[PDB]
Design a protein around this ligand. Structure first.
Ligand SMILES: COC(=O)[C@@]12OC[C@]34[C@H]([C@@H](O)[C@@H]1O)[C@@]1(C)CC(=O)C(O)=C(C)[C@@H]1C[C@H]3OC(=O)[C@H](OC(=O)/C=C(\C)C(C)C)[C@@H]24
Ligand SMILES: [Cl-]
Ligand SMILES: [Cl-]
Ligand SMILES: [Cl-]
Ligand SMILES: [K+]
Ligand SMILES: [Mg+2]
Ligand SMILES: [Mg+2]
Ligand SMILES: [Mg+2]
Ligand SMILES: [Mg+2]
Ligand SMILES: [Mg+2]
Ligand SMILES: [Mg+2]
Ligand SMILES: [Mg+2]
Ligand SMILES: [Mg+2]
Ligand SMILES: [Mg+2]
Ligand SMILES: [Mg+2]
Ligand SMILES: [Mg+2]
Ligand SMILES: [Mg+2]
Ligand SMILES: [Mg+2]
Ligand SMILES: [Mg+2]
Ligand SMILES: [Mg+2]
Ligand SMILES: [Mg+2]
Ligand SMILES: [Mg+2]
Ligand SMILES: [Mg+2]
Ligand SMILES: [Mg+2]
Ligand SMILES: [Mg+2]
Ligand SMILES: [Mg+2]
Ligand SMILES: [Mg+2]
Ligand SMILES: [Mg+2]
Ligand SMILES: [Mg+2]
Ligand SMILES: [Mg+2]
Ligand SMILES: [Mg+2]
Ligand SMILES: [Mg+2]
Ligand SMILES: [Mg+2]
Ligand SMILES: [Mg+2]
Ligand SMILES: [Mg+2]
Ligand SMILES: [Mg+2]
Ligand SMILES: [Mg+2]
Ligand SMILES: [Mg+2]
Ligand SMILES: [Mg+2]
Ligand code: NA
Ligand code: NA
Ligand code: NA
Ligand code: NA
Ligand code: NA
Ligand code: NA
Ligand code: NA
Ligand code: NA
Ligand code: NA
Ligand code: NA
Ligand code: NA
Ligand code: NA
Ligand code: NA
Ligand code: NA
Ligand code: NA
Ligand code: NA
Ligand code: NA
Ligand code: NA
Ligand SMILES: [Sr+2]
Ligand SMILES: [Sr+2]
Ligand SMILES: [Sr+2]
Ligand SMILES: [Sr+2]
Ligand SMILES: [Sr+2]
Ligand SMILES: [Sr+2]
Ligand SMILES: [Sr+2]
Ligand SMILES: [Sr+2]
Ligand SMILES: [Sr+2]
Ligand SMILES: [Sr+2]
Ligand SMILES: [Sr+2]
Ligand SMILES: [Sr+2]
Ligand SMILES: [Sr+2]
Ligand SMILES: [Sr+2]
Ligand SMILES: [Sr+2]
Ligand SMILES: [Sr+2]
Ligand SMILES: [Sr+2]
Ligand SMILES: [Sr+2]
Ligand SMILES: [Sr+2]
Ligand SMILES: [Sr+2]
Ligand SMILES: [Sr+2]
Ligand SMILES: [Sr+2]
Ligand SMILES: [Sr+2]
Ligand SMILES: [Sr+2]
Ligand SMILES: [Sr+2]
Ligand SMILES: [Sr+2]
Ligand SMILES: [Sr+2]
Ligand SMILES: [Sr+2]
Ligand SMILES: [Sr+2]
Ligand SMILES: [Sr+2]
Ligand SMILES: [Sr+2]
Ligand SMILES: [Sr+2]
Ligand SMILES: [Sr+2]
Ligand SMILES: [Sr+2]
Ligand SMILES: [Sr+2]
Ligand SMILES: [Sr+2]
Ligand SMILES: [Sr+2]
Ligand SMILES: [Sr+2]
Ligand SMILES: [Sr+2]
Ligand SMILES: [Sr+2]
Ligand SMILES: [Sr+2]
Ligand SMILES: [Sr+2]
Lengths: 56, 237, 73
RNA sequence: CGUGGAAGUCUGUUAGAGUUGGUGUCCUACAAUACCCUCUCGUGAUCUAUGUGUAGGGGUGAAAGGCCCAUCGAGUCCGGCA
RNA sequence: GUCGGGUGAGAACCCCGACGGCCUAAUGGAUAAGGGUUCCUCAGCACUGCUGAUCAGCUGAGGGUUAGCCGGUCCUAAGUCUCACCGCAACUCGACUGAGACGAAAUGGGAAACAGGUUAAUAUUCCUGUGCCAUCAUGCAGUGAAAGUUGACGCCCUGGGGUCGAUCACGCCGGGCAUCGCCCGGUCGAACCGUCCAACUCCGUGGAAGCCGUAAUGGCAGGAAGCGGACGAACGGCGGCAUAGGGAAACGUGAUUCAACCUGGGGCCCAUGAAAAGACGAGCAUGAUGUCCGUACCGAGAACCGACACAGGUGUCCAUGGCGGCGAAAGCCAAGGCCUGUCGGGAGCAACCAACGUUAGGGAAUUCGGCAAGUUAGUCCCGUACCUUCGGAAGAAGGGAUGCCUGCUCCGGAACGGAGCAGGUCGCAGUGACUCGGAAGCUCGGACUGUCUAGUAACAACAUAGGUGACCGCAAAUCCGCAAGGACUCGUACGGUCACUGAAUCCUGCCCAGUGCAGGUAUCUGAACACCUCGUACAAGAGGACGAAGGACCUGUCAACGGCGGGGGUCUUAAGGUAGCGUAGUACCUUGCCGCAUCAGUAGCGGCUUGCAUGAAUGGAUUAACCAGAGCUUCACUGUCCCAACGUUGGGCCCGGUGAACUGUACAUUCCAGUGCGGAGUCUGGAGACACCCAGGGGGAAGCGAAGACCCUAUGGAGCUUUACUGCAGGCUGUCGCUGAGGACUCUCACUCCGGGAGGAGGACACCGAUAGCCGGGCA
RNA sequence: CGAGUGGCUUGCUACCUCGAUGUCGGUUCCCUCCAUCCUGCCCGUGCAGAAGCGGGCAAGGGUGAGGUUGUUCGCCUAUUA
RNA sequence: ACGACCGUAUAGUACGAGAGGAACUACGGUUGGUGGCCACUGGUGUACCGGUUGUUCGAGAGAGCACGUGCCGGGUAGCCA
């Protein structure tokens, strides 16, 4: 079986969904954690300094 | 390189864990204050998935249903006594002090009141030899003279299910089934058949170990493979 | 008694199973009566079809040479 | 002689799994691994759905440096960085 | 697909009829996930649709999903999260322990619904009829109430009960066909309420010393058969439900085989086959309440994933429609679906190509190689070698038979089940299509089933049982974590960790010098602290004393890394190749020599064998069985070949419509020679050359495609190794702190562990913090 | 011993190509060279004849089938002008 | 667009002690190559005719499907060796 086109057919699982906190389609319904804002993981909002260039 | 199989083990992942949720009971001795007036009737004889030997279901005088390690010859209806002045019958639990010398014993305790540590596998037994006011010398199944406290409880008789090791597995499938019930990753790929990155014995154009197999005791995990601190190797000499 | 193994496995693999299964499905004496009705139930578990006596013994033998040593003392 | 119906047992495009050869067809494809015939396994160390666990010098590996979302002799993203 | 017709400005592909086809585990029916309005109606053709379109999953506007009893909801599963606690410099980090919560929509558990009707679109939801469950209120009954039962369970074989379906018999209703009288469809009717009970278990009677019983096992004076009885099943029978419903009508009755469903008997495990909520236990009336969320449609060769209306991928239930046959097989055909695996028209339709049929005579001569193709084939009877681990080899091989028709026999209760007999009889052919092994022998490898490089390797590689060695008594060995802690472990040597070899059988020689590991060690060497000397009003510093692990040294060990020669009738460096096997998948020489076989044999096999450089768990030898593994030989077969031909289907060619891409410094009708950075359409000399277009097979453009993987180079990169350099974890060991009383000893009070507790074991050690020495490719 | 011709072998060199001029053997299909194996015409002979040996002119045509080996090469068989 | 070979007569002759053994010439055929042609032999012939298995149209008659003929037998024209 090829890792390409024939392995794409099995992809019917729902993981990333609309988040209650930030509104982005990043709430992993199996992990109960948001990959965008960190909802489910932290009380604080997920922000990182590398999301922008060092001197910006 | 990459961490070896023995290192992946300690992480305690699903593959390396024992199917605990499928295990029946943690076979320990009953906690009596003093006296002897604790006896029970054997209701059933069950199979223990954890040790492949049989386990006896007993109901006590005070109405306690608990599984106990089954010795040889113990059946349904039989009465077993637990306590200090218990009857010296096969299947009864009483401290090593009360048990006479030259009598085969099983489920021996290390520290008095722990519930039994030694001689628990199929058909094995510990031999009680010397008596004192201080020490009770018990000869464990390995042939080692273990000096124990006389207050350590023990069940009389050999463990049931003897001679299991006598008949071969014959086929790989039978091993498969046995191993699916234990805390062991199976099958075993030889290190010599792996890549250099994966094991100290991996690599080469032909399959042979790199350095000698006898490794030092002080070797770090990742290097401690082959013959660990071997006093000698081989059959001859 | 290992004809289910076919032309595979070898002598010792089917000889040590033949001596084990011929002395297992055999008529052995019971501790409660004088009947030879002792049959196997599983690994180490034995039972007599007479007085419903379900007991413990060896894995393939109802009595091991080590279990008979306890009877002495 | 019959009974019995064992088996990592046999035949088998039963369902299902797999993929030996044709170095056939295709090779700006139907398809970033496809088509056809042939071939193998098919009560078991079997196959499978869903749920669940293991995470990057770390997993997982019946071991091929295989696999970890078309990415692996060290994933991906962004940053270090012009 | 075709002929008619419909609508329309317009019709090959939108609709109707007819005729002709396609799909049968799917191309039919119901669904999970996923999609998200794709569903229905009306109006449209600018977009989308492999051509067109009046059509549409497209555009626009409207509309559409109704529940006490179908799911969710509740329960708990692997497991997840939160809180507390502890760790961490710290956290959004981290293991344990507690508490709480979450965790199952087809497909775990679970209170209760069936029949019919209705819409453009919903439907166990609405409507009609009937029924059921739970809670609560009232009334009566009831004092029981929680023990127990259920929920609730593996794999294999099998009996019995039994419905649907299918088929048979016969009767009724309707249709079809028309030499016959055969053929098809229907002949209905639920939930629920009531009732019946086989199996199992048990009781009374009874009194078997050989009987009872089974498909099989089996049962019994510890009481068999027989007789009576208690308990007790179906999604089943029976009655009601039903002068309900449904049907144009009739509106059946018996039977066989019997999925579902019910209930038993047996066997297997170095495998032992969930839990919880809930229900039962524990009555009846009447009335009330029964909220909330899902509900459309697709579910695929156009509604999902794969950029696409993608030949790919994607779970479940229908596995009992008919003939056929062993069959859920082929082939054919219903019910149902479809003509949308969606561009057409034309040319005896050329060459050439893809799939394929048939080829005389020869028969592997083809080729690295029978690659490709073909041969064989189902069933019964006869018959069957070497070898063998006694299982197998084996369907060995080889031989015969095979239809239809008439009338019968046998087995069985019977089948629309099976096995046979006699007579007749047709063909070239009777498993007549379909389905359906080619056979034999020698050798190598791996024992076997199994595993693998998703996407050029399926193999001799991995695994395996078996063999073996190693470590560890559990406060263990081994392993993970920085720590708090953790896996192994609901485990305890018949254990489980770490390695090697790789079934069985016969065996497995010699070497401990080097390296490794381990034990020992008078003596030597061996760090820091403390101690002593010198030094300094102190300190730096220098020396001494003692001396741990380690090393030196000695010993053990090769199924530990590995070794098993040169010379002569010992030498290196310990030994000096034993059984076997041998020109090997290992043999340079080499196509070794002899033999087999062939006309001819670098092949293959046997023998010899001084073996460039075989050899014993770096396992040697051997071997029955197995194999999409490597090599060879024979029989059979054939278009592989001699040597090619004709045919078939789809293309190709012409026409309508749709309509890309690769590539492009320029110029360009070239050819033969030469020249040039030595491989020129373009330079030089000649020759040839009127322009344009169609089809072709690919000689050239050192054709197009990719800043060559080969090679070298760069004070480039990465993965990997080690006795490379330097360091870092880790282990061992000394010392200081915790740390206490009286070079050997006693104690108990810190601290550790065991115990529920009382208390017990241990004990100034261990753990932990710090420092020092050794080992230290485990890692950088 | 001496003098040469070829560019089929091997070697040498590093001119050409590393933003790629696809490998060996084989096959199929086309053209050519002569240093001629056969065929035609010749000269010599240790030329009786027959069969040969050596040489000359000559490239029109021909030069085939098979066994081992991937082989080129070669060894081998039976045919052959 | 033809190349080459074998055979007969020459001839058991010339030659030679014998053994052995020619040529000119004239004929017949074969092989390779070449061009063409289909009366004859052969192949094909999913034109056509027949037989026959399974299933479907009730049987009969007559048909469809079984991969582009279900299979088997025969085979005209044409095209071919
Ligand atoms: C498409 O390939 C080529 O053009 C090559 O030309 C002939 C060639 C080469 C190169 O010239 C060149 O790269 C050599 C002729 C060069 C050379 O020096 C040599 O010694 C050999 C061995 C070449 C033969 C051939 O080799 C190829 O690998 C090499 O082929 C390749 O390198 C690669 C190919 C076909 C693709 C994988 C890219 C050839
Ligand atoms: Cl084991
Ligand atoms: Cl639902
Ligand atoms: Cl039964
Ligand atoms: K090049
Ligand atoms: Mg226990
Ligand atoms: Mg073992
Ligand atoms: Mg497991
Ligand atoms: Mg292994
Ligand atoms: Mg490898
Ligand atoms: Mg390493
Ligand atoms: Mg090996
Ligand atoms: Mg080895
Ligand atoms: Mg999974
Ligand atoms: Mg490798
Ligand atoms: Mg419309
Ligand atoms: Mg509908
Ligand atoms: Mg389509
Ligand atoms: Mg022929
Ligand atoms: Mg073949
Ligand atoms: Mg009869
Ligand atoms: Mg060989
Ligand atoms: Mg194998
Ligand atoms: Mg591959
Ligand atoms: Mg394979
Ligand atoms: Mg082993
Ligand atoms: Mg072992
Ligand atoms: Mg192997
Ligand atoms: Mg040989
Ligand atoms: Mg040895
Ligand atoms: Mg380059
Ligand atoms: Mg390189
Ligand atoms: Mg580097
Ligand atoms: Mg504790
Ligand atoms: Mg390194
Ligand atoms: Mg080229
Ligand atoms: Mg000349
Ligand atoms: Mg010429
Ligand atoms: Mg040839
Ligand atoms: Na028998
Ligand atoms: Na295939
Ligand atoms: Na990484
Ligand atoms: Na169309
Ligand atoms: Na009933
Ligand atoms: Na049938
Ligand atoms: Na198999
Ligand atoms: Na040594
Ligand atoms: Na050797
Ligand atoms: Na296999
Ligand atoms: Na052909
Ligand atoms: Na060209
Ligand atoms: Na690398
Ligand atoms: Na020259
Ligand atoms: Na040269
Ligand atoms: Na070539
Ligand atoms: Na010539
Ligand atoms: Na040859
Ligand atoms: Sr999936
Ligand atoms: Sr979290
Ligand atoms: Sr931040
Ligand atoms: Sr405990
Ligand atoms: Sr315990
Ligand atoms: Sr190695
Ligand atoms: Sr030895
Ligand atoms: Sr291939
Ligand atoms: Sr194609
Ligand atoms: Sr391809
Ligand atoms: Sr083919
Ligand atoms: Sr099979
Ligand atoms: Sr099988
Ligand atoms: Sr950057
Ligand atoms: Sr459907
Ligand atoms: Sr228009
Ligand atoms: Sr529609
Ligand atoms: Sr829940
Ligand atoms: Sr359910
Ligand atoms: Sr099952
Ligand atoms: Sr039945
Ligand atoms: Sr619906
Ligand atoms: Sr599909
Ligand atoms: Sr595929
Ligand atoms: Sr139909
Ligand atoms: Sr279309
Ligand atoms: Sr024919
Ligand atoms: Sr051949
Ligand atoms: Sr035959
Ligand atoms: Sr795979
Ligand atoms: Sr062996
Ligand atoms: Sr040594
Ligand atoms: Sr020798
Ligand atoms: Sr010019
Ligand atoms: Sr072309
Ligand atoms: Sr000549
Ligand atoms: Sr050949
Ligand atoms: Sr060459
Ligand atoms: Sr040679
Ligand atoms: Sr003559
Ligand atoms: Sr003569
Ligand atoms: Sr047809």
């Amino acid at each position: 079986t090829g890792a390409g086109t024939p392995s794409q057919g099995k992809k019917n699982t729902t993981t990333h969904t609309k988040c209650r906190r930030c509104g982005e389609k990043s709430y992993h319904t199996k992990k109960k954690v948001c990959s965008s804002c960190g909802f489910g993981k932290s009380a604080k909002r997920r922000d990182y300094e590398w999301q922008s260039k060092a001197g910006e | 390189g990459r961490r070896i199989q023995g290192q992946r083990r300690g992480r305690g992942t699903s593959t390396f864990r024992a199917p605990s949720h499928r295990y029946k009971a943690d076979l320990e001795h009953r906690k009596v204050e003093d006296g002897d007036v604790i006896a029970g009737t054997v209701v059933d004889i069950e199979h223990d998935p954890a040790r492949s030997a049989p386990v006896a279901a007993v109901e006590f005088e005070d109405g306690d249903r608990r599984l106990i390690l089954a010795p040889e010859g113990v059946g349904v209806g039989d009465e077993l006594q637990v306590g200090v002045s218990a009857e010296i019958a096969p299947g009864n639990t009483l401290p090593l002090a009360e048990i006479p010398e030259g009598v085969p014993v099983c489920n021996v305790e290390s520290s008095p009141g722990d519930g039994g540590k030694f001689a628990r596998a199929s058909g094995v037994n510990a031999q009680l030899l010397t008596h004192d006011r201080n020490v009770a010398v018990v000869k464990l199944p390995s042939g080692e003279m273990k000096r124990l406290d006389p207050q350590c409880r023990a069940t009389i008789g050999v463990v049931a299910g003897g001679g299991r090791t006598d008949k071969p597995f014959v086929k790989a499938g039978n091993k498969h089934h046995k191993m699916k019930a234990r805390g062991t990753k199976w099958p075993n790929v030889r290190g010599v058949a792996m890549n250099a990155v994966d094991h100290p014995f991996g690599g080469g154009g032909r399959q042979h170990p790199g350095k000698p197999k006898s490794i030092s005791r002080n070797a770090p995990p990742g290097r401690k493979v082959g013959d660990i601190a071997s006093k000698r190797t081989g059959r001859g000499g | 008694s290992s004809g289910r193994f076919g032309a595979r496995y070898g002598r010792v693999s089917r000889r040590r199973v033949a001596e084990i299964e011929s002395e297992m499905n055999e008529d052995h004496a019971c501790p409660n009566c004088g009947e030879d009705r002792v049959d196997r139930q599983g690994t180490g578990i034995w039972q007599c079809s007479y007085c419903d006596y379900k007991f413990t013994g060896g894995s393939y033998k109802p009595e091991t040479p080590g279990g008979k040593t306890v009877r002495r003392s």
